[PDB]
Design a protein around this ligand. Structure first.
Ligand SMILES: C[S@@+](CC[C@H](N)C(=O)[O-])C[C@H]1O[C@@H](n2cnc3c(N)ncnc32)[C@H](O)[C@@H]1O
Ligand SMILES: CS(=O)(=O)N1CCC(NC(=O)c2cc(C3CC3)on2)CC1
Ligand SMILES: [Mg+2]
Ligand SMILES: [Mg+2]
Ligand SMILES: [Zn+2]
Ligand SMILES: [Zn+2]
Ligand SMILES: [Zn+2]
Length: 425
């Protein structure tokens, strides 16, 4: 039986609420996507199907755009790739991610059996916020509609090839406020998908639930105690954002004004912005390029830019400043991927206290970060320190990831290895 149910909220549209009392870590729902694709930066880096990285991927011979880790993935992906394949081949132009995503929505709705992803709420039901769109946003959606019509012309010529009364403008409006960014085990963004049942969850800047991805598969878990009838919330946004930054994104993407306690009080903003404003404004600007490079897996270039900040001859920022913290995290991940494990541990350890502050309670991003640090410590022989961090990662990740997520198995192996080392000491 389901532990969650759809309901009509008083002022947030539809939402999801608890049917039974829920405890931290309880699995509330799990879902494959209605439709999903690899994101722009990870195309050709991770498998189109399973979203895992590999040194060499094999390409679809027909379109040479879709790429896969294995014959198994390429073959299993064929039914959901077959129609877009003809469109991608007809396109050296590659569509925006949202256009490729909507193509897969249309093909799934036209050719696929009813999707379990739509059990609680369907693509047809999703919020569009059309009456809140500003004119500039409408113009952007009109351009996406025309982009879709161009890209899909080989497979979709008339309304007979779309679901009944399907409106492409409305569909793109739904995609804007209902797309989920799929993250790999290391918390790198790798894809985008629609999960219409999960789209019932409203946003909170201090939520009681959390989602995590295991490949394209989404797990929804409680991260606080939740009472019968209490609304379930997730945080739509990166935690390393000020209330002004959250306000802008919640308006621009989601068309709402957040009334939560954190927004009313600018909770943590001042700490997030400590240090000299001229310095952090420059770092924030540099992070556009750093994050672009990271999205494309260009670790050597990421690291060079990060070192120029972290070890600048010029003025520096405290590690609790969120822009400095993002630079440290990018540098850590670059060092891990480049095998510079001593340097990775230096940056990673510096992030630990800021992460404790900015990811309160049980948050999967902190769990993964702590696990990465513990793993670095374990393989450099720091057994007691590694064990403390691996146990802390497990305390978080038992709640945020759970036994159904494969990363928990990897963590259990690290704990057993570290424990065996301490026992032989
Ligand atoms: C992923 S949908 C959530 C389900 C949605 N309420 C519905 O009726 O389908 C995101 C949209 O829900 C609304 N929403 C989500 N969180 C909200 C909040 N804290 N306050 C007001 N509206 C919210 C906004 O319309 C937002 O664009
Ligand atoms: C744990 S996280 O910090 O790494 N996390 C947060 C940023 C991103 N979130 C979303 O894509 C998203 C979208 C929605 C609703 C459809 C609106 O809810 N969440 C994924 C990763
Ligand atoms: Mg509606
Ligand atoms: Mg409305
Ligand atoms: Zn694969
Ligand atoms: Zn193809
Ligand atoms: Zn808020």
């Amino acid at each position: 039986p389901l532990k969650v149910e759809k309901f009509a909220t008083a002022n947030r549209g539809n939402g999801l609420r608890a049917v039974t009392p829920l405890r931290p870590g309880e699995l509330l729902f799990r879902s494959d996507p209605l439709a999903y694709t690899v994101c722009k930066g990870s195309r050709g880096v991770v498998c189109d199907r399973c979203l895992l990285g590999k040194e060499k991927l094999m390409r679809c011979s027909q379109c040479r755009v879709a790429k896969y880790c294995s014959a198994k993935c390429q073959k299993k992906a064929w039914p959901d790739h077959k129609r877009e394949c003809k469109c991608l081949k007809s396109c050296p132009r590659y569509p925006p991610d949202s256009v490729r995503l909507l193509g897969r929505v249309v093909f799934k709705l036209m050719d696929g059996a009813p999707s379990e992803s739509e059990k609680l709420y369907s693509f047809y039901d999703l919020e569009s916020n059309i009456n809140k769109l500003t004119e500039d946003k409408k113009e952007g959606l009109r351009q996406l509609v025309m982009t879709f019509q161009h890209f899909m012309r080989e497979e979709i010529q008339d309304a007979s090839q779309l679901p009944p009364a399907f409106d492409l403008f409305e569909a793109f409006a739904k995609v804007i406020c209902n797309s989920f960014t799929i993250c790999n085990a290391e918390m790198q963004e790798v894809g985008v998908g629609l999960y219409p049942s999960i789209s019932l969850l409203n946003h909170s800047c201090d939520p009681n639930c959390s989602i995590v991805f295991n490949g394209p598969h989404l797990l929804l878990r409680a991260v606080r105690d939740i009472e019968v009838g209490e609304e379930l919330t997730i945080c739509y946004l990166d935690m390393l954002m000020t209330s002004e930054e959250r306000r802008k994104q919640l308006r621009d993407q989601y068309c709402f004004e957040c009334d939560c306690f954190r927004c009313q009080t600018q909770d943590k903003d001042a700490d997030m912005l400590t240090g000299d404003e001229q310095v952090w404004k420059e770092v924030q600007e540099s992070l556009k390029k750093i994050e672009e490079l990271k999205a494309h897996w260009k670790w050597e270039q990421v690291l060079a830019m990060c070192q120029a900040i972290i070890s600048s001859n010029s003025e520096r920022l405290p590690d609790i400043n969120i822009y400095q913290l993002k630079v440290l995290d990018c540098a850590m991940d670059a060092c891990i991927n480049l095998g510079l494990l001593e340097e990775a541990l230096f940056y990673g350890t510096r992030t630990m206290e800021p992460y404790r502050i900015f990811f309160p309670g049980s948050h999967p991003v902190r769990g993964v970060q702590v696990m990465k640090v513990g793993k670095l410590q374990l393989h450099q022989g720091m057994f007691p320190q590694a064990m403390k961090n691996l146990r802390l990662a497990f305390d978080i990740m038992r709640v945020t990831h759970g036994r159904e997520h494969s990363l928990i198995e990897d963590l259990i192996l690290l704990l057993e290895e570290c424990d065996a080392n301490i026992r032989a000491s």
